[PDB]
Structures are given as C-alpha cells and as structure tokens.
Design a protein around this nucleic acid. Structure first.
Lengths: 215, 81, 76, 31, 205, 52, 129, 95
RNA sequence: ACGAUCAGAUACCGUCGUAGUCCUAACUAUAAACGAUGUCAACCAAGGAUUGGAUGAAAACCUUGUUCAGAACUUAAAGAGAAAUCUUGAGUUUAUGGACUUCAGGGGGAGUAUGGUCACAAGGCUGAAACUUAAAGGAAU
RNA sequence: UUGAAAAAAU
C-alpha cells in the first residue's frame, strides 16, 4: 500500500494486470507488495536456516541466515537470502527478497506438442561458485530426478520432468539453490529457432501510462 | 498459452533480451513532419545491456539511425553493413 | 615459428595476382667443423648439432622423393 | 577491433597502410 | 521523410559554433569518437565535423522532445562541472525538465527509500568524465542516456553522443542553448522561421 | 691520455633515454671540439680526465 | 600447426558471434568449409558468404545475423552408423527440435535429418545450435 | 600467495644478474632486486658553510658536492626507514 | 682457535685462519634449475610507452604516420576461477573434442626398503609394501 | 645490547 515507485503506482490502481507484462520490458520489481498483488497464493518453502558467526573481542556475534524459495507452479519462481539476529525476522526478511527476485521460467515439451508444458525447453546450466547444475529435458513420466535441495525449488517453479547432473561442492546448500535458480534464470535468454521471429510492436507500460501517473 | 511472453529482440545484435537485464534501454524516435514538428508516431529501438557497457551502443545506433534515415552522413559508407 | 629457436618471423616474398642445392648450402657444417681450434666453444658445438640434425632431415626427404641416390650419407 | 568495418570492400587508403601479406589480396610493394 | 529539408543548420548556427570553437576538441582521441573527428589540428588536437555535430544534436533533441512533450519531469539533466551549472539550470527553466545542479548523490536513482529519489525515463549529462556516476546508475534502471561527449571521454553507457567541446565556457553554454532551442522547435512552441528571443549570454556562466 | 664522453639529449627530444647502439659507439672511438662526432651522435660532456 | 582448418574457421565464427560482430573472415578456405556453411545457410543460421580467390586457397567473408549460438568441430571424425545417431544427438545437441549435426557421407556433406532420410552413415564433421 | 606481480625484482627477460652489496649490511643482493638510492650532499653542511666562506684562502671558490649511489637489501631498507610497508592497494603505486 | 653476551653459547657480535673461493684437464648432473604456468596453431576490448628493421613527411641523433618481430605495462561494467588474481590467457569449457608429450589420485610411512644401473666418492636415476590416522591442505573474512 | 618457559579434557 502507498507505493513509492512509478511501476508500483501502476499496479495498485490495477493498470498492470499480468506479471509477465513487467517481465517483457525488464522493469525491475523494487517493492515486494507488487508481487503479492499480481501473483496471489504463492506457495512457501524454507530451504535451510544456517548460522554465520563473527569473532569479536568480547565473543562471537552470531546471526541466522535464511534461504527461502518462493513461486507459483505456473512458471514463476524466486530465491531470497537474509541474515538477522532472529529466526522469525530472518524468514520475513528473506520473504521480501524472494518476491523481489521473481524470474519467469521457460518450459517446453520433450518431443510432441501435446499440452501442456512439463519440462525445460533446452539444456540449461547455472553457475554459482564451485557448484554447477545442469538441467536436461525429460519425457513425460519421469519426475524431477534431482537432489532433495533443488527438487524442492523445481517443484515451486512448476517443472515436473527434468534430468539433472551436478558438479562441485553440493554439500553447501547456499550455492546449490543459487546455481539451480541461476540455471532457470537464463532459460529465456537462449534464443532457440522458434524465437527468431522479431514480434509485433509493443509499448512499455511505463510509457503507455506515463501521462496518467504524472498526476 | 505455452509461452509466458514473447521476449524483445535487440535491434543492434538481433539477440534476445533477458528479463533480469537491467542495462537494456528503449529509445523512441518520433517521426517529424514537413514543418519540423514531432508526431505521435515513433519507431522504437532496443539495445542490449552488454552492448552499452562496451562503448558500442552509440556507434551501433548510428548505423541503425542512418539506415532508417534519421541521420544523413554521420557514418561513412565503408562502415555500413 | 622457426624450426629450433622460438622466433616467429613472417617476412615473405609476395608473388602478385598475375601469371603473365639447399642441402648443398647446408654443408655451413663444414665451416663450423673452426671447431678444431676452438675446442672449448660449447656454443658452436651445439649449433653444429642443430645444423647436422637439419641435414639428416633433408636427406631423409630427398631419398623418399627419389632425388638423391639411395646410397647417400653425409659424413666428414 | 571493436568498431566494425566492411571486410569485402576495403577502403583505398586502408589497403595501402596494411602489411603486404595482410591485405585482402596480397600484392607486393615493388615494381 | 525522416530528415526533412527544414532541418539543415542555418548559417547563424554554424557561425556561432566556430566562434565558440565547438569543433575544437582535446588531444587524446577515443576510438569510438573517430567517426565524428574530421581531421587533426595544427598542434595535434581533434576537430569535430560540424555537420556530424548538428545531425546528432537534432537527433538528441528529437528524442528529448518526444519524451518531454507530455511528462516534462521525466527528463533529468545532470551537470557536474562548475562551468555548466548555469546552462543546465536554464535548460530546466524553459522545458520543465528536472536538472540536478551540483554534486549527484549516489543512489538517487536506485534507493527508493530516499526522499530525493527520482525515477526518470531519460538522462542528459553535461560531461561523461565528470558525471560518470550518473551514467553508471542508468545501467541499473534501464534508462537511456545522452551525453555531450568529447574526443577523449569514454562512451560507456551513452546512447546518443554529441561531439562538442564540453570544457570551454562558451561552447558549454552554446550547445545547451542550441539543444533547448531545438527542443522547443520540435515541440511546436517556437517557430522555425523566427529568432529566439533569449540570447546565448543568459546561458553563459 | 684518457678521454670521456656522454651521449646528450636534444632540444626536441621527448623520450627519456638517449642510448647509442654498439655499432655507433665504436665509431666515436687546454680546447674537445671531438664533438664535431656530432655527425654520429649527440655529445655534450667531453673531457680529458687523465694524462700519464 | 594448422591440423584442422575446419576447427579454426568454426572457432573464429563462434568468437565473432559472441561479440556481436556483423561479419567474420576465414583465412584458409576449403571445399569442406564451404560445404559446411551451406548446411548452416540452408537453415538460415548465416545470411551468406563470399569466397574471395587469392591464388593461395583464398579467404572467406561470412555474414552473420544474430542467430548462431555455437558451431563446433568434432575431433577425429568418428564413423557414425545410422543406429548411432540418436546417441550422438542426445550428447551434442541442446534439444530434439533445435540443434543440427553435420556428417560427411558418400552423398556429400549432409546434416542428420537428411542423412537419415537419405539412409546413409558417415564420418561426423561437427554441429551447430 | 603472490604478493607481487614482478616478484619484487625488476628483471623480465633475463635469467641471471650480478649480485651487489647492501650498503649497511654487506649482504649479497641481486642487482635488479636492490633498493637503489642516489645521494647528492655538500661536503660542508649548512651550519659550517658560513665559517668556511668567512676565512677562505680563495677568491670565488664554489664548494663541491658528493655523489654516491647506495643499494640496500630489503630488510635493511625497511629497518633503515628508506622504504615502508605500504597499503595493499598502495603497493601497485610506482611513483 | 680465541674474546665477548648469556643460566649455558659448541650460535648471531669481534679478531685470526685450513679446505675452498681463480685457471687448466677429467668427473659429478643436482637448485625456490620459478613465470612454481609444457611445445605447436587459430580467434580475441581499449590505451600509452619501449628495443631492432622497413616505409612517407619533417633539415646518422631527434619529432611524427603505417607495418613487421621482441621483453614488458595500464583499464575493464566483459570472459574464467574457490579466491587471490589472469587478459600477448589461467579467455574462446556440462554450450564439455585443434595436435602431441610428461606428470597427480587423502596425510604420513617415503623418494624409505629391496632389485637394476651410473659415479673414484658424495650421491643420481627407476622405486614399493606392512603399518598408522580423520583429516592434511588452498584462497580469503 | 639482554626478554627462556606456561600440563590434559571442557
């Protein structure tokens, strides 16, 4: 309520309907309340609750770092990280970052265009630090063949069939989820053959309604 | 529908634009009449993020502007491809 | 680059776009083999091995090309 | 380079500057 | 068509640019600015092509005019160097475009929680070398930029570059004066066949 | 008779170091005016430092 | 030394496309490199090319249009039986609908979809997304 | 690991250089790795040049200056305060 | 070998001094022998400067433009990586295949034992196992 | 110019 951004103003008065209308034009989401408006009923998952420490003269200053993955099962997902002195505040703080870090997930078919979309369109690899995760499209029956850590994330993104091959120190969970999210994050940057067509002339929402929000 | 959306295509590199690409721009050049006053009609140019951060956006656009006619002699003949 | 040293020289003759013994010269080996008086010259005693290894490669080729007679062999 | 130029049709001046073997069609500098 | 005949630079405009030695640039030449450079001067300095200066000048003004013809506040004109403070301030007066006068506080395009947080759709900088901070913040908000680049500046995160002398007092005031006049001509609020009342001396520092 | 010398700079010279080649050096080998070797290199500090 | 001219050309084309260059140049041009481009041209991955004769196996200038992702050669050309195709497709190609293999068969230099139609095998040259 | 890109020396395209002697310790140090300083000093200090010129046996004698080039090892250079341990970013500065 | 300092000093500190440090002849064949970075080839952002030619102007040396080869340097919002950092690669790599050679498989035991061979010798090269133990280690905060 | 050492598990 009472947004502080131009895009955030458009959403509150119901001028921007779909979330993907934001994603086409690269408009950054700077308020989490925007995601809660155009993406109702976001399922919730908490991956790990890891504690970091800082050595001081008196002792150790411990803070709790929380990874949360968010997203509806219709091709939208996000991952957020926040560390704070309390567990309740850490999840709430990571909640906001997860919503602000929403990213569309491109999914296609394996071999036949029989609805509906189930698996990734091509081969994607996400590079966190030493951990590398590779996603391979799979036939209809095969589930999410992956470790328990990215399988929880891939469920939220709405990918039901996938083949995964992992490399690196997967025992550190922070990089494992980040490498999973990094693989999906670039699914829409791989210009396949079917995306050759330029497309029609569209207009940015921040330009269509530029005069309207001026007052 | 299967696609979430149809991503934009960079006018300079003829390559897709990422949803997280926060350096890409969108330059609108309105058409002008015989009197020399702008019109509500305009043409839209999109430049990818990585192109800008190299020093290439300005020269690459001049190739497109000259081709579309908004410039006359900025870019030499042997530099147009 | 060069056959033995790491130099990379690209100087070349340039035949235009219009169409309108070396083994003997490499026997240099005689000149260095000078070595009879400068016995301590460990440099020329190395550049001679390089020259002689070149000769054993041109002979090895001129025999395959059936240019030199099959009994040829370079020696002092 | 980063500022891309035409390769098929080099300028008259540019082929005079470049190395004789590095021209589009190598030609000597003699007569 | 796209560059009609009403858009040649009249002899008045060319007469003043040579007078204000706009064409005179620096000594070190950036690779990206070789096209605008016509020839080197007698003491090894770049001499910008006056026609190439004007063609880019009008094109920049056309882009500003379209964006600023309904939302004047959506254009931001930053000017770091003390020389260009007055001219940047008059540009704000006659078009309604916001203009940051002095130092540009970092995070004024990215930190929404700021009280002075502005979110524009176009940015005009007086000098990319002095105002590198403003140019770098554009790469976070998807906002195209326009610069009065010189022969030595780096063309990173600039889309429309106007080759002109951005160090002298006269050229700095003159080019901003031409940009404001050209913008008004495109807006239709100033006839092309008349003379602008305000003299260049108002823009001068 | 011992002589000394040093290759000199030039009025328009920009590069810091003015060294002579080995081939050039061998050519230069009450008043010392030796200097006019000015057709081989630029020399300024020419003295006779010892006589035995 | 230049063991494989095709490898040098493909790696030169891939580098140019990453930088967004408008055209590239390949110094030693062979019939195999010319025929490899026709497979990429027939799929509209590259606009066209121009074999300029220099009396020394002249150069090539290739026009690219923002479509090629990666074209790579394969080291020694493995004999590929027709039953070994989908094993190779499942490795070198991103998806069943996008990639394209290249094989030098007795019927010229074909791709996978038309060597399969022609019912032939052969040595594998390379691939391109 | 690598504290310096040139490994603290100034040798690039050679394999060996002659040693020299640290001016304060006599330690054998390579010529290129030595800390080189050039000193030009008057033989007569400022506190005495008045007396020397006062009762001088000559007319217009111009007093001379010494010229000695000093080379130190690293340990003697730091201890002698010739050079200091600079900041991590200030290490690259070469002026 | 003396004299100091010290709890002691067989060490750093001072003094004297054999082999050795130099040359010739024959051995030895190891170094933090290092760029801790194999050789060869293709592509590859921006900039200043330098060693040696060639080529125009400027009246051998200096000033400027092009180009070839060499030792290097600076910037990156890009590429790589665990990071330090690298960019004339440590880039073009899960989107993995340019050619070839050598080397490594947790830490010790150990470059040790035995066998072979080279050397006058010290030693070099090739080179294990039994057993023992949950870490040993790298870069950065 | 001198300044050696600080048991094991928590």
């Amino acid at each position: 309520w009472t947004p502080v951004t131009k895009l955030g103003r458009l959403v509150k008065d119901g001028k921007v309907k779909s979330i993907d209308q934001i994603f086409e034009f690269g408009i950054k989401i700077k308020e989490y309340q925007i995601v809660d408006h155009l993406l109702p009923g976001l399922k919730e998952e908490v991956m790990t609750m890891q504690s970091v420490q800082k050595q001081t003269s008196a002792g150790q200053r411990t803070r709790l770092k929380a990874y949360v993955a968010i997203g509806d099962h219709n091709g939208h997902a996000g991952l957020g990280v926040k560390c704070a002195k309390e567990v309740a505040e850490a999840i709430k703080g990571a909640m906001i970052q997860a919503k602000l870090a929403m990213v569309p997930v491109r999914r296609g078919y394996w071999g036949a265009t029989i609805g509906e979309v189930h698996t990734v369109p091509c081969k994607l690899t996400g590079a966190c630090g030493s951990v590398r995760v590779r996603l391979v499209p799979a036939p209809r029956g095969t589930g999410i063949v992956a470790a328990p850590t990215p399988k929880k994330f891939l469920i939220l993104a709405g990918i039901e069939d996938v083949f995964t091959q992992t490399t690196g120190h997967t025992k550190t969970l922070g990089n494992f989820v980040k490498a999973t999210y990094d693989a999906v994050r670039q699914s829409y940057g791989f210009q396949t053959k079917d995306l050759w067509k330029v497309g029609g002339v569209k207009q940015s929402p921040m330009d269509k309604y530029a005069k309207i929000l001026a007052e | 529908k299967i696609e979430l959306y149809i991503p934009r295509h960079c006018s300079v590199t003829h390559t897709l634009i990422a949803a997280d690409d926060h350096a890409a721009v969108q330059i609108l050049v309105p058409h002008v009449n015989e009197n020399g006053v702008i019109l509500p009609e305009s043409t839209v140019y999109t430049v990818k993020g990585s192109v800008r951060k190299d020093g290439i956006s300005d020269h690459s656009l001049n190739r497109q502007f000259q081709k579309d006619g908004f410039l006359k002699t900025v870019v030499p003949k042997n530099m147009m491809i | 680059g060069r056959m033995y040293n790491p130099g990379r020289g690209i100087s070349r003759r340039c035949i235009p776009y219009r169409r309108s013994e070396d083994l003997y010269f490499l026997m240099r080996a005689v000149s260095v083999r000078h070595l009879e008086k400068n016995k301590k010259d460990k440099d020329a005693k190395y550049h001679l091995i390089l020259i002689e290894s070149k000769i054993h490669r041109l002979t090895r080729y001129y025999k395959s090309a059936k240019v030199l007679e099959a009994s040829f062999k370079y020696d002092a | 380079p980063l500022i891309e130029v035409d390769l098929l049709n080099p300028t008259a001046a540019s082929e005079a500057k470049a190395h004789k073997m590095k021209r589009l069609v190598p030609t000597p500098n003699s007569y | 068509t796209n560059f009609p005949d009403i858009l040649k630079p009249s002899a008045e405009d060319i007469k003043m640019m040579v007078a204000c030695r706009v064409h005179i640039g620096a000594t070190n030449l950036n690779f990206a600015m070789e096209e605008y450079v016509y020839e080197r001067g007698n003491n090894n300095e770049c001499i910008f092509n006056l026609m190439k200066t004007w063609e880019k000048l009008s094109l920049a003004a056309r882009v500003i005019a379209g964006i600023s013809n309904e939302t004047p506040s959506d254009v931001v004109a930053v000017a770091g160097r003390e020389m260009a403070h007055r001219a940047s301030l008059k540009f704000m007066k006659y078009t309604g475009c916001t203009a940051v006068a002095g130092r540009f506080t970092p995070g004024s395009f990215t930190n929404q929680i700021q009280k002075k947080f502005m979110e524009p759709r176009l940015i005009i900088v007086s000098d990319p070398s002095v105002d590198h901070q403003a140019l770098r913040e554009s790469g976070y908000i998807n906002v195209p930029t326009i610069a009065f680049c010189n022969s030595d500046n780096s063309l990173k995160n600039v889309d429309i570059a106007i080759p002109c002398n951005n160090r002298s007092r006269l050229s700095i005031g003159l080019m901003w004066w031409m940009l404001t006049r050209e913008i008004l001509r495109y807006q239709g609020k100033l006839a092309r066949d008349e003379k602008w009342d305000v003299m260049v001396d108002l823009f001068l520092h | 008779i011992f002589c000394i010398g040093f290759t000199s700079r030039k009025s328009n010279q920009i590069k810091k170091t003015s060294y002579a080649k080995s081939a050039q050096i061998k050519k230069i080998r009450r008043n010392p005016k030796i200097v006019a070797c000015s057709k081989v290199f630029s020399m300024d500090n020419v003295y006779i430092r010892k006589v035995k | 030394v230049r063991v494989n001219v095709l490898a040098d050309a493909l790696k030169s084309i891939t580098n140019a496309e990453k930088q967004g260059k408008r055209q590239v140049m390949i110094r030693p041009a062979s019939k195999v490199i010319c025929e490899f481009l026709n497979v990429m041209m027939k799929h509209q991955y590259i606009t066209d090319y121009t074999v300029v004769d220099t009396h020394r196996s002249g150069k090539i200038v290739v026009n690219l249009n923002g479509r090629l992702n990666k074209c790579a050669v394969i080291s020694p050309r493995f004999n590929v039986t027709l039953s070994e195709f989908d094993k190779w497709e499942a490795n070198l190609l991103p998806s069943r609908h996008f990639g394209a293999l290249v094989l030098t068969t007795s019927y010229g230099i074909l791709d996978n979809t038309e060597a399969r139609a022609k019912h032939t095998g052969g040595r594998i040259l390379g691939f391109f997304y | 690991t690598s504290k310096r890109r040139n490994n603290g020396r100034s040798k690039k395209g050679r394999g060996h250089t002659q040693n020299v002697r640290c001016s304060h310790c006599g330690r054998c140090v390579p010529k290129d790795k030595a800390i080189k300083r050039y000193q030009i000093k008057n033989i007569v200090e400022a506190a005495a040049v008045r007396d020397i010129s006062d009762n001088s046996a000559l007319t217009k004698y111009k007093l001379p200056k010494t010229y000695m080039k000093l080379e130190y090892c690293v340990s003697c250079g730091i201890h002698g305060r010739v050079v200091r341990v600079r900041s991590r970013t200030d290490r690259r500065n070469r002026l």
